């Protein structure tokens, strides 16, 4: 499974090196975005328990947020900042970099591990 591939070989991109955010490049792109930059991605995500999914392709469009401004979970602010234009990466994320012990009830259970596929389409400035 894609999660498994991440857990065994994936790159630890956390500062603390605690394996809370792991990354596999699936496609190499072609500069990575700065804090405050406007980011454009396609993503799919899911809970480790296999009980919930979500995809940008549902909106049939890109997901957009401002990098590093805590508008998304910490894993994204860290993860997307490591990506180049064109890149597709998988991220496997422990709760400490997502919704923690409190979770986001009932959407995200307590202590949930998450997985995302992210394609970095572009990124503009403030
Ligand atoms: C916890 O709430 C959601 C989580 C997710 C998707 C949602 O809606 C499509 C959610 O409810 C709407 C709130 C959104 O504005 C945003 O605040 C969520 C922040 O989400 C994130 O930071 C991350 C990264 C960006 C994509 C969304 N993602 C999520 O955690 C999804 C989860 C992913 C696991 C499957 C369930 C939804």
UniProtKB/Swiss-Prot annotation:
Induction context: By androgen.
Gene from which this protein is expressed: FKBP5
Modifications after synthesis and translation: Acetylation impairs ability to promote interaction between Akt/AKT1 and PHLPP1. Deacetylation by SIRT7 promotes interaction between Akt/AKT1 and PHLPP1, leading to suppress Akt/AKT1 activation.
Full protein name: Peptidyl-prolyl cis-trans isomerase FKBP5
Subunit and interaction comment: Part of a heteromultimeric cytoplasmic complex with HSP90AA1, HSPA1A/HSPA1B and steroid receptors. Upon ligand binding dissociates from the complex and FKBP4 takes its place. Interacts with functionally mature heterooligomeric progesterone receptor complexes along with HSP90 and TEBP. Interacts with NR3C1. Interacts with Akt/AKT1 and PHLPP1; enhancing dephosphorylation and subsequent activation of Akt/AKT1. Interacts with IFI44L; this interaction modulates the kinase activity of IKBKB and IKBKE. Interacts with IKBKB and IKBKE.
Tissue: Widely expressed, enriched in testis compared to other tissues.
Top-level taxon of origin: Eukaryota
Modification type N6-acetyllysine: residues: 16
Result of altering residue 16 to R: Decreased acetylation; promotes interaction with AKT1 and PHLPP1
Residues annotated as domain PPIase FKBP-type: 30-116
Protein purpose: Immunophilin protein with PPIase and co-chaperone activities. Component of unligated steroid receptors heterocomplexes through interaction with heat-shock protein 90 (HSP90). Plays a role in the intracellular trafficking of heterooligomeric forms of steroid hormone receptors maintaining the complex into the cytoplasm when unliganded. Acts as a regulator of Akt/AKT1 activity by promoting the interaction between Akt/AKT1 and PHLPP1, thereby enhancing dephosphorylation and subsequent activation of Akt/AKT1.
Subcellular location: Cytoplasm; Nucleus
């Amino acid at each position: 499974g894609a999660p498994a591939t991440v857990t065994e070989q994936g790159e630890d991109i956390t500062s603390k090196k605690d394996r809370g955010v792991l990354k596999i490049v699936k496609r190499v792109g072609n500069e990575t975005p700065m804090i405050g930059d406007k980011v454009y991605v396609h993503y799919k995500g899911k809970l480790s328990n296999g009980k919930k999914f979500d995809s940008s392709h549902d909106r049939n469009e890109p997901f957009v947020f401002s990098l590093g401004k805590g508008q998304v979970i910490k894993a994204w602010d860290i993860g997307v900042a490591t990506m180049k234009k064109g890149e597709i990466a998988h991220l496997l994320i422990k709760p400490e970099y997502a919704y923690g012990s409190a979770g986001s009830l009932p959407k995200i259970p307590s202590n949930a591990t998450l997985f995302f596929e992210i394609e970095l389409l572009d990124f503009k400035g403030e």
